[PDB]
Amino acid sequence: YVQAQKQFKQAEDSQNSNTLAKLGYAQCLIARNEVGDATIYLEKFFKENQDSKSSEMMLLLGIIYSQSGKSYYKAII
């Protein structure tokens, strides 16, 4: 998980257009139980890329917000 997350970060730094690398980075954050860190990274990516059609990213955001509970409105959206 540490090595995979580092590799995903290096992939993102090499070419920022690789959305799959960032999604794998968030998945690795989830793997390391970094719920808050993954949430912050996902919010940063979504706010920078509000027009991106990453359906799985939005599904993961909704699941995270439902687990949080207070952010139900973003989860619905």
């Binding site: 998945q27 989830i30 793997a31 993961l60 699941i63 687990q67």
Partner: peptide, 13 residues
């Protein structure tokens, strides 16, 4: 089942 932390972890990962 997705309301439990462990299945959530398994599904997301």
């Amino acid at each position: 089942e997705i309301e439990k932390e462990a299945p959530q972890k398994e599904f997301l990962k």
